């Protein structure tokens, strides 16, 4: 499944875009 | 859990922000 993460997608996840949540920018990782 | 949806969060979900994925804007819904 895909998740919003800060600072970055972790090992085994790939970045597909970004999220805005709680006034901050997150990586959208699947 | 939270998900990115187009056009909008559905009944029983609340919008907490947005996602950018595949060149489009999505609602971030929890």
In contact, B28 and A20? CB cutoff 8 Å: yes
Q: Which of B19, A29, B13 is nearest to B29 (CA)?
A: B13
Nearest residue, CB atoms, B21 vs list A1, A16, A21:
A16
Nearest residue, CB atoms, B20 vs list A17, A21, A22:
A17
Provide the residue ranges of all domains of chain A, joining segments of one domain with +. Answer: 1-30
**B7 torsion bin: left (phi>0), alpha (psi -120 to 50), beta (else):** alpha
In contact, B20 and A18? CB cutoff 8 Å: yes
User: Method of determination?
Assistant: X-ray
Q: What is the resolution of this structure in A?
A: 2.0
- Cβ–Cβ below 8 Å for B4 and A1: no
């Amino acid at each position: 499944d895909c998740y919003c993460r800060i600072p970055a997608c972790i090992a085994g996840e790939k970045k597909y875009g970004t999220c805005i949540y709680q006034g901050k920018l997150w990586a959208f990782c699947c």
